[PDB]
């Protein structure tokens, strides 16, 4: 009966598809993570009423500036994603993503989403960033940017362990109905 359109944006390789799949199947897809996310319409009861949570991935569109906006119309809430182990993706939230969605949907709330937090303490990941004079993004650092860009809030999760996964979407729903 009621609908909520949520669009997941952010740099490629940030785990957008994975977190969408991990959330809709309720388990990390071991060994093989599908390239195409298919569970776009999640039916859920909210405030005693029937709803459909429309989830839309944007993976593979990071260089398609002419096609990307096609997904934006009537969006009730955006998930601007970045990997906490990818400084470039984090910087692009400010330099690219928020400016783009704000331009097409100035009145649509958005959540800043930190992904792949399971990798934050991974020795091998940490050393690759150090070799580049960088360190993984901490939530304090992320919260500062979420404040700067006027995000509804900052949330992080791991598609792999699912820690924080469900909260991300509960918050999205709240933001959408806010």
């Amino acid at each position: 009966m009621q609908t909520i359109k949520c669009v997941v944006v952010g740099d490629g390789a940030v785990g957008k598809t994975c977190l969408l799949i991990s959330y809709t199947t309720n388990k990390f897809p071991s060994e093989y993570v599908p390239t195409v996310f298919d569970n776009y319409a999640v039916t859920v009861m909210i405030g005693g009423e029937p709803y459909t949570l429309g989830l839309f991935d944007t993976a593979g569109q990071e260089d398609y500036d002419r096609l990307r906006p096609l997904s934006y119309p009537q969006t009730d809430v955006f998930l601007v994603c970045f990997s906490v182990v990818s400084p470039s993706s984090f910087e692009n939230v400010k330099e690219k993503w928020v400016p783009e969605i704000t331009h097409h949907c100035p009145k649509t709330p958005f959540l800043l989403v930190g992904t792949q937090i399971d990798l934050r303490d991974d020795p091998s990941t940490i050393e690759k960033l150090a070799k580049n004079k960088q360190k993984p993004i901490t939530p304090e650092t992320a919260e500062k940017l979420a404040r700067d860009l006027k995000a509804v809030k900052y949330v992080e999760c791991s598609a792999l362990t699912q820690k924080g996964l469900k909260n991300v979407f509960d918050e999205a729903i709240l933001a959408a109905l806010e």
């Binding site: 569970n39 839309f56 398609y64």
Partner: protein, 165 residues
């Protein structure tokens, strides 16, 4: 009352008309090229998932197969990156033309998208009309047509499949 799958499909057809890929493509060469890459990336993605799911269910390793379609994607003109000797085109993921059709139909007729089978059927129908709409954009083009590319990947896949049971 009425409200059938046909009603929803026709609406998606209406929405495809509103986005008008052909007209946009004719007025902006960048839109056209992006469309071609996006489309061929969707063909890649669909075949990658369909074959990988099969292979994995049969207990086969997908690496050598991914390596080959990666090369096919590369030769198709799709940019990308290589990891563990396997090339993956950057456009692989979500077809940018699908969401406007699917998100709009779900918003207008949500009761028709509750059933999982129906969801899949509408997505498949959307892919089909999108493919038909974009075909002429590949006329007299160096890139393979979506039809040729799909055939190229299927033959590759078929080679791995006939070596499994």
């Amino acid at each position: 009352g009425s409200l059938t799958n046909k009603v929803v499909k026709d609406f998606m057809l209406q929405t495809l008309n509103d986005i008008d890929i052909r007209g946009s493509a004719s007025k902006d060469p960048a839109y056209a090229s992006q469309t071609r890459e996006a489309i061929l990336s969707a063909v890649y993605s669909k075949n990658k998932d369909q074959c990988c799911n099969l292979l994995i269910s049969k207990g086969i390793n997908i690496a050598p197969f991914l390596q080959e379609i990666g090369e096919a994607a590369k030769n198709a003109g799709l940019p990308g990156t290589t990891k563990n000797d396997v090339f993956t085109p950057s456009g692989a993921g979500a077809n940018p033309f699908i969401t406007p059709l699917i998100s709009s139909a779900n918003s207008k007729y949500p009761r028709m998208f509750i059933n999982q089978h129906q969801q899949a059927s509408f997505k498949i129908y959307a892919e089909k009309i999108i493919m038909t709409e974009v075909a002429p954009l590949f006329n007299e083009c160096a890139m393979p047509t979506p039809q040729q590319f799909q055939l190229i990947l299927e033959n590759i896949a078929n080679k791995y499949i006939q070596n499994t049971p």
